[PDB]
Amino acid sequence: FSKYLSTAPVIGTLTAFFLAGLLIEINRFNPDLLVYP
Amino acid sequence: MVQRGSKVRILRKESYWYQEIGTVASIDQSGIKYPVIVRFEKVNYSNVNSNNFSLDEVVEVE
Amino acid sequence: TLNLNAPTPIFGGSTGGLLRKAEVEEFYSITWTGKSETVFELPTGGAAIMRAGENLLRLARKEQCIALGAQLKDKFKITDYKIYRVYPSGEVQFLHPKDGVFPEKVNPGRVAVGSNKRRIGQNPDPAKLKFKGQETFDS
Amino acid sequence: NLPSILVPMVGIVLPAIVMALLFVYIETDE
Protein backbone atom coordinates (compact mmCIF):
# COMPACT_ATOMS: atom_id res chain seq x y z
CA PHE A 1 0.00 0.00 0.00
CA SER A 2 2.96 2.30 0.56
CA LYS A 3 4.30 1.22 -2.84
CA TYR A 4 0.86 2.10 -4.18
CA LEU A 5 1.02 5.62 -2.72
CA SER A 6 4.33 6.26 -4.50
CA THR A 7 2.55 5.91 -7.87
CA ALA A 8 1.98 9.00 -10.03
CA PRO A 9 -1.83 9.60 -9.67
CA VAL A 10 -1.97 9.48 -5.87
CA ILE A 11 1.27 11.42 -5.27
CA GLY A 12 0.17 13.75 -8.04
CA THR A 13 -3.04 14.31 -6.09
CA LEU A 14 -2.03 14.52 -2.40
CA THR A 15 0.77 16.98 -3.14
CA ALA A 16 -1.69 18.96 -5.26
CA PHE A 17 -4.04 18.53 -2.30
CA PHE A 18 -1.19 19.83 -0.14
CA LEU A 19 -0.20 22.71 -2.42
CA ALA A 20 -3.81 23.82 -2.88
CA GLY A 21 -4.55 23.68 0.86
CA LEU A 22 -1.35 25.64 1.38
CA LEU A 23 -2.79 28.35 -0.87
CA ILE A 24 -6.30 28.05 0.59
CA GLU A 25 -5.21 28.59 4.20
CA ILE A 26 -2.97 31.52 3.19
CA ASN A 27 -5.94 33.50 1.82
CA ARG A 28 -7.91 32.97 5.05
CA PHE A 29 -5.49 34.68 7.45
CA ASN A 30 -3.85 36.88 4.77
CA PRO A 31 -6.74 38.01 2.55
CA ASP A 32 -6.45 40.05 -0.65
CA LEU A 33 -2.67 40.15 -1.11
CA LEU A 34 -2.26 42.28 -4.22
CA VAL A 35 1.24 43.65 -3.67
CA TYR A 36 4.14 43.33 -1.27
CA PRO A 37 3.56 46.05 1.37
CA MET B 1 35.85 -2.49 -36.62
CA VAL B 2 33.09 -2.63 -34.00
CA GLN B 3 32.62 -5.62 -31.70
CA ARG B 4 29.65 -6.77 -29.66
CA GLY B 5 28.82 -4.79 -26.53
CA SER B 6 30.54 -1.66 -27.87
CA LYS B 7 28.70 1.60 -27.22
CA VAL B 8 28.27 3.33 -30.58
CA ARG B 9 26.85 6.57 -31.92
CA ILE B 10 24.70 6.37 -35.03
CA LEU B 11 25.53 8.52 -38.06
CA ARG B 12 22.59 7.34 -40.19
CA LYS B 13 20.80 10.64 -40.71
CA GLU B 14 17.44 9.02 -41.48
CA SER B 15 17.39 6.92 -38.30
CA TYR B 16 15.31 7.70 -35.22
CA TRP B 17 18.46 7.26 -33.09
CA TYR B 18 20.71 9.48 -35.21
CA GLN B 19 23.54 10.94 -33.08
CA GLU B 20 22.45 8.83 -30.10
CA ILE B 21 24.21 6.18 -28.03
CA GLY B 22 23.49 2.48 -28.38
CA THR B 23 25.20 -0.81 -27.60
CA VAL B 24 25.94 -3.26 -30.41
CA ALA B 25 24.25 -6.57 -29.70
CA SER B 26 26.01 -8.51 -32.47
CA ILE B 27 27.73 -8.36 -35.84
CA ASP B 28 27.07 -10.78 -38.68
CA GLN B 29 30.12 -12.83 -39.67
CA SER B 30 29.44 -12.83 -43.41
CA GLY B 31 29.53 -10.31 -46.23
CA ILE B 32 25.94 -9.16 -45.71
CA LYS B 33 25.37 -5.44 -46.08
CA TYR B 34 24.13 -3.71 -42.90
CA PRO B 35 25.37 -6.36 -40.39
CA VAL B 36 25.70 -4.21 -37.25
CA ILE B 37 22.80 -4.77 -34.84
CA VAL B 38 22.50 -2.01 -32.24
CA ARG B 39 20.12 -2.16 -29.28
CA PHE B 40 18.81 1.16 -27.98
CA GLU B 41 17.28 2.27 -24.71
CA LYS B 42 14.74 4.47 -26.51
CA VAL B 43 11.99 3.03 -28.71
CA ASN B 44 11.05 4.65 -32.01
CA TYR B 45 7.49 5.30 -33.13
CA SER B 46 7.03 1.66 -34.16
CA ASN B 47 8.23 0.77 -30.61
CA VAL B 48 11.21 -1.32 -31.70
CA ASN B 49 14.71 -1.18 -30.25
CA SER B 50 17.02 -2.67 -32.89
CA ASN B 51 18.18 -1.99 -36.43
CA ASN B 52 20.82 -3.16 -38.90
CA PHE B 53 23.49 -0.55 -39.61
CA SER B 54 26.79 -0.65 -41.46
CA LEU B 55 30.24 0.12 -40.09
CA ASP B 56 30.22 3.45 -41.94
CA GLU B 57 27.25 4.64 -39.85
CA VAL B 58 28.71 3.77 -36.43
CA VAL B 59 31.70 4.85 -34.35
CA GLU B 60 33.59 3.47 -31.33
CA VAL B 61 32.86 5.89 -28.48
CA GLU B 62 34.05 3.73 -25.58
CA THR C 1 -8.72 -21.89 -65.16
CA LEU C 2 -11.85 -20.35 -63.66
CA ASN C 3 -13.90 -23.58 -64.13
CA LEU C 4 -17.12 -21.57 -64.56
CA ASN C 5 -19.69 -22.99 -64.13
CA ALA C 6 -18.92 -23.97 -60.54
CA PRO C 7 -21.53 -24.05 -57.75
CA THR C 8 -22.16 -20.84 -55.84
CA PRO C 9 -22.51 -21.41 -52.07
CA ILE C 10 -26.01 -21.81 -50.65
CA PHE C 11 -26.47 -18.14 -49.86
CA GLY C 12 -29.42 -16.16 -51.28
CA GLY C 13 -28.79 -12.54 -50.28
CA SER C 14 -26.39 -9.55 -50.08
CA THR C 15 -27.49 -6.24 -51.51
CA GLY C 16 -23.84 -5.34 -50.90
CA GLY C 17 -22.18 -7.07 -53.83
CA LEU C 18 -21.45 -7.27 -57.57
CA LEU C 19 -23.22 -4.25 -59.03
CA ARG C 20 -22.95 -2.65 -62.53
CA LYS C 21 -19.13 -2.39 -62.41
CA ALA C 22 -18.92 -6.17 -62.89
CA GLU C 23 -20.68 -6.38 -66.26
CA VAL C 24 -18.60 -3.71 -67.99
CA GLU C 25 -15.05 -4.43 -66.77
CA GLU C 26 -13.11 -6.31 -64.10
CA PHE C 27 -14.88 -8.43 -61.60
CA TYR C 28 -13.10 -11.18 -59.71
CA SER C 29 -13.79 -14.75 -58.65
CA ILE C 30 -12.24 -16.79 -55.84
CA THR C 31 -12.31 -20.58 -56.16
CA TRP C 32 -11.58 -23.06 -53.38
CA THR C 33 -12.39 -26.53 -52.06
CA GLY C 34 -14.01 -26.41 -48.63
CA LYS C 35 -13.69 -29.60 -46.62
CA SER C 36 -17.06 -29.35 -44.81
CA GLU C 37 -20.57 -27.95 -45.19
CA THR C 38 -19.84 -25.15 -42.74
CA VAL C 39 -20.85 -21.50 -42.55
CA PHE C 40 -18.45 -18.66 -43.30
CA GLU C 41 -18.85 -14.90 -43.35
CA LEU C 42 -18.80 -13.16 -46.69
CA PRO C 43 -17.25 -9.74 -47.29
CA THR C 44 -20.73 -8.65 -48.47
CA GLY C 45 -22.97 -9.72 -45.56
CA GLY C 46 -22.44 -12.67 -43.29
CA ALA C 47 -23.08 -16.33 -44.04
CA ALA C 48 -23.15 -18.53 -46.91
CA ILE C 49 -22.24 -22.20 -46.41
CA MET C 50 -19.17 -23.70 -48.08
CA ARG C 51 -19.94 -26.66 -50.34
CA ALA C 52 -18.08 -29.93 -50.57
CA GLY C 53 -16.91 -28.49 -53.88
CA GLU C 54 -15.25 -26.97 -56.16
CA ASN C 55 -16.68 -23.83 -54.49
CA LEU C 56 -16.70 -20.52 -56.40
CA LEU C 57 -17.77 -16.99 -55.50
CA ARG C 58 -17.93 -13.97 -57.81
CA LEU C 59 -16.68 -10.91 -55.93
CA ALA C 60 -16.48 -7.25 -56.89
CA ARG C 61 -12.96 -6.37 -55.71
CA LYS C 62 -9.64 -8.18 -55.38
CA GLU C 63 -9.49 -6.67 -51.90
CA GLN C 64 -12.65 -8.64 -51.06
CA CYS C 65 -11.07 -11.83 -52.41
CA ILE C 66 -7.93 -11.68 -50.26
CA ALA C 67 -10.07 -10.78 -47.24
CA LEU C 68 -12.18 -13.89 -47.83
CA GLY C 69 -9.07 -15.87 -48.79
CA ALA C 70 -7.58 -14.94 -45.42
CA GLN C 71 -10.66 -16.18 -43.56
CA LEU C 72 -10.48 -19.60 -45.22
CA LYS C 73 -6.83 -19.87 -44.20
CA ASP C 74 -7.50 -18.62 -40.66
CA LYS C 75 -10.73 -20.21 -39.49
CA PHE C 76 -10.99 -23.34 -41.65
CA LYS C 77 -7.30 -23.87 -42.63
CA ILE C 78 -8.28 -24.33 -46.30
CA THR C 79 -5.46 -22.41 -47.99
CA ASP C 80 -6.30 -23.66 -51.50
CA TYR C 81 -8.03 -20.42 -52.52
CA LYS C 82 -7.26 -19.46 -56.11
CA ILE C 83 -8.55 -16.08 -57.24
CA TYR C 84 -9.13 -14.99 -60.84
CA ARG C 85 -10.24 -12.03 -62.89
CA VAL C 86 -12.50 -12.51 -65.88
CA TYR C 87 -12.49 -12.54 -69.72
CA PRO C 88 -13.80 -10.40 -72.45
CA SER C 89 -15.69 -8.10 -70.07
CA GLY C 90 -12.76 -8.56 -67.63
CA GLU C 91 -8.97 -8.22 -67.71
CA VAL C 92 -6.47 -10.79 -66.34
CA GLN C 93 -6.81 -14.49 -65.53
CA PHE C 94 -5.11 -16.28 -62.60
CA LEU C 95 -4.18 -13.49 -60.20
CA HIS C 96 -3.12 -15.63 -57.21
CA PRO C 97 -1.00 -17.72 -56.46
CA LYS C 98 0.87 -15.96 -59.25
CA ASP C 99 3.84 -18.34 -59.49
CA GLY C 100 2.37 -21.53 -58.05
CA VAL C 101 3.20 -20.57 -54.45
CA PHE C 102 2.13 -18.07 -51.81
CA PRO C 103 3.89 -14.68 -51.94
CA GLU C 104 5.23 -14.92 -48.38
CA LYS C 105 7.09 -18.07 -49.46
CA VAL C 106 10.33 -17.69 -51.41
CA ASN C 107 10.29 -18.91 -54.98
CA PRO C 108 13.29 -18.77 -57.34
CA GLY C 109 12.56 -17.43 -60.79
CA ARG C 110 10.78 -14.37 -59.46
CA VAL C 111 12.43 -11.04 -60.27
CA ALA C 112 12.76 -8.19 -57.78
CA VAL C 113 10.36 -5.62 -59.23
CA GLY C 114 10.39 -2.22 -57.55
CA SER C 115 13.71 -2.83 -55.83
CA ASN C 116 16.11 0.00 -55.05
CA LYS C 117 19.87 -0.28 -54.64
CA ARG C 118 19.99 2.56 -52.09
CA ARG C 119 18.51 3.63 -48.76
CA ILE C 120 15.81 6.24 -48.19
CA GLY C 121 18.17 8.84 -46.74
CA GLN C 122 20.16 8.54 -49.97
CA ASN C 123 17.16 9.83 -51.92
CA PRO C 124 18.01 12.98 -53.90
CA ASP C 125 16.48 16.36 -53.32
CA PRO C 126 13.59 17.23 -55.67
CA ALA C 127 15.46 20.38 -56.73
CA LYS C 128 18.11 18.19 -58.36
CA LEU C 129 15.38 16.43 -60.36
CA LYS C 130 13.43 19.61 -61.13
CA PHE C 131 12.10 20.16 -64.68
CA LYS C 132 12.97 16.57 -65.63
CA GLY C 133 11.03 13.37 -66.17
CA GLN C 134 12.81 11.70 -63.27
CA GLU C 135 11.10 11.33 -59.89
CA THR C 136 12.66 11.57 -56.42
CA PHE C 137 12.26 7.83 -55.70
CA ASP C 138 12.56 5.98 -59.03
CA SER C 139 15.92 4.58 -60.08
CA ASN D 1 -34.78 49.90 -66.77
CA LEU D 2 -31.38 48.49 -67.66
CA PRO D 3 -31.04 46.89 -64.16
CA SER D 4 -34.23 44.91 -64.80
CA ILE D 5 -32.75 43.33 -67.94
CA LEU D 6 -29.14 42.82 -66.88
CA VAL D 7 -29.44 41.22 -63.42
CA PRO D 8 -31.56 38.20 -64.52
CA MET D 9 -29.21 37.81 -67.48
CA VAL D 10 -26.02 37.31 -65.46
CA GLY D 11 -27.89 36.13 -62.38
CA ILE D 12 -29.70 33.29 -64.17
CA VAL D 13 -29.06 33.02 -67.91
CA LEU D 14 -25.32 33.66 -68.20
CA PRO D 15 -24.38 31.19 -65.39
CA ALA D 16 -26.59 28.58 -67.08
CA ILE D 17 -24.66 29.05 -70.32
CA VAL D 18 -21.17 28.83 -68.81
CA MET D 19 -22.30 25.84 -66.74
CA ALA D 20 -23.25 24.16 -70.01
CA LEU D 21 -19.95 24.70 -71.85
CA LEU D 22 -17.98 23.69 -68.75
CA PHE D 23 -20.01 20.51 -68.19
CA VAL D 24 -19.44 19.56 -71.83
CA TYR D 25 -15.74 20.49 -71.58
CA ILE D 26 -15.39 18.38 -68.43
CA GLU D 27 -17.12 15.22 -69.62
CA THR D 28 -15.75 15.22 -73.15
CA ASP D 29 -12.84 12.98 -74.07
CA GLU D 30 -10.16 12.77 -76.74
Binding site: I24, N27, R28, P31 | - | - | -
Partner: protein, 107 residues
Protein backbone atom coordinates in the same frame (compact mmCIF):
# COMPACT_ATOMS: atom_id res chain seq x y z
CA UNK E 1 -43.83 28.78 -2.43
CA UNK E 2 -41.96 31.79 -1.03
CA UNK E 3 -38.74 30.20 0.24
CA UNK E 4 -36.27 28.98 -2.37
CA UNK E 5 -34.86 25.47 -1.82
CA UNK E 6 -31.23 25.54 -0.82
CA UNK E 7 -28.29 23.41 0.21
CA UNK E 8 -24.49 23.68 -0.26
CA UNK E 9 -23.42 26.56 1.94
CA UNK E 10 -20.19 28.11 0.62
CA UNK E 11 -17.19 28.71 2.87
CA UNK E 12 -16.12 32.25 3.91
CA UNK E 13 -12.94 32.40 1.81
CA UNK E 14 -11.69 34.60 -1.12
CA UNK E 15 -15.13 35.91 -2.08
CA UNK E 16 -17.13 32.82 -2.95
CA UNK E 17 -19.18 33.54 0.18
CA UNK E 18 -21.06 35.97 -2.10
CA UNK E 19 -22.63 32.81 -3.55
CA UNK E 20 -24.30 32.31 -0.16
CA UNK E 21 -27.19 34.50 -1.21
CA UNK E 22 -30.46 35.66 0.28
CA UNK E 23 -32.24 32.40 -0.47
CA UNK E 24 -35.10 32.60 2.03
CA UNK E 25 -35.90 32.93 5.71
CA UNK E 26 -32.83 33.02 7.91
CA UNK E 27 -30.56 30.89 5.74
CA UNK E 28 -27.85 31.69 3.21
CA UNK E 29 -26.62 29.27 0.59
CA UNK E 30 -26.94 28.11 -2.99
CA UNK E 31 -30.46 27.91 -4.42
CA UNK E 32 -30.50 24.31 -5.57
CA UNK E 33 -32.50 22.95 -8.48
CA UNK E 34 -32.50 19.22 -7.77
CA UNK E 35 -35.98 18.84 -6.32
CA UNK E 36 -34.86 16.98 -3.23
CA UNK E 37 -36.97 19.31 -1.09
CA UNK E 38 -40.07 18.33 -3.08
CA UNK E 39 -39.09 14.66 -3.13
CA UNK E 40 -38.62 14.56 0.65
CA UNK E 41 -41.93 16.32 1.22
CA UNK E 42 -43.73 13.71 -0.87
CA UNK E 43 -41.93 11.03 1.15
CA UNK E 44 -43.35 12.69 4.25
CA UNK E 45 -40.15 13.95 5.87
CA UNK E 46 -40.73 16.83 8.28
CA UNK E 47 -37.50 17.11 10.34
CA UNK E 48 -33.78 16.97 9.59
CA UNK E 49 -33.22 13.96 11.87
CA UNK E 50 -35.00 11.75 9.33
CA UNK E 51 -32.59 13.02 6.67
CA UNK E 52 -29.57 12.54 8.95
CA UNK E 53 -30.30 8.88 9.64
CA UNK E 54 -30.95 8.22 5.94
CA UNK E 55 -27.51 9.63 5.15
CA UNK E 56 -26.13 7.17 7.70
CA UNK E 57 -28.42 4.52 6.23
CA UNK E 58 -26.96 5.00 2.76
CA UNK E 59 -23.35 4.88 3.98
CA UNK E 60 -23.88 1.55 5.74
CA UNK E 61 -25.59 0.36 2.55
CA UNK E 62 -22.64 1.68 0.54
CA UNK E 63 -20.29 -0.36 2.72
CA UNK E 64 -22.70 -3.29 2.34
CA UNK E 65 -22.51 -3.16 -1.46
CA UNK E 66 -18.74 -2.58 -1.41
CA UNK E 67 -18.28 -5.56 0.90
CA UNK E 68 -20.51 -7.58 -1.42
CA UNK E 69 -18.27 -6.75 -4.36
CA UNK E 70 -15.22 -7.87 -2.43
CA UNK E 71 -17.03 -11.03 -1.35
CA UNK E 72 -18.45 -12.06 -4.72
CA UNK E 73 -15.13 -11.82 -6.56
CA UNK E 74 -12.40 -12.58 -4.03
CA UNK E 75 -14.21 -15.04 -1.74
CA UNK E 76 -17.37 -16.51 -3.31
CA UNK E 77 -17.45 -15.91 -7.05
CA UNK E 78 -20.36 -17.54 -8.92
CA UNK E 79 -19.70 -19.75 -11.92
CA UNK E 80 -20.74 -19.13 -15.52
CA UNK E 81 -23.96 -21.15 -15.15
CA UNK E 82 -25.13 -18.83 -12.38
CA UNK E 83 -25.04 -15.95 -14.87
CA UNK E 84 -26.55 -17.67 -17.92
CA UNK E 85 -29.83 -18.34 -16.07
CA UNK E 86 -31.82 -15.51 -17.62
CA UNK E 87 -35.27 -16.94 -16.89
CA UNK E 88 -34.70 -17.17 -13.14
CA UNK E 89 -33.07 -13.74 -13.29
CA UNK E 90 -36.08 -12.25 -15.10
CA UNK E 91 -38.40 -13.94 -12.59
CA UNK E 92 -36.51 -12.44 -9.67
CA UNK E 93 -35.99 -8.91 -10.96
CA UNK E 94 -39.60 -8.51 -12.10
CA UNK E 95 -41.47 -9.66 -9.01
CA UNK E 96 -38.73 -9.03 -6.47
CA UNK E 97 -36.82 -5.94 -7.54
CA UNK E 98 -39.57 -4.18 -9.47
CA UNK E 99 -42.64 -5.72 -7.87
CA UNK E 100 -41.73 -5.78 -4.19
CA UNK E 101 -39.86 -2.52 -4.73
CA UNK E 102 -43.13 -1.00 -5.89
CA UNK E 103 -45.10 -3.01 -3.33
CA UNK E 104 -42.97 -1.85 -0.41
CA UNK E 105 -42.93 1.73 -1.66
CA UNK E 106 -46.71 1.50 -1.92
CA UNK E 107 -46.61 0.66 1.78
Amino acid sequence: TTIKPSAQVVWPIVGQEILNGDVGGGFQGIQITSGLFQMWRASGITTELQLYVTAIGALVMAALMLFAGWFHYHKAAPKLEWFQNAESMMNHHLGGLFGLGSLSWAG
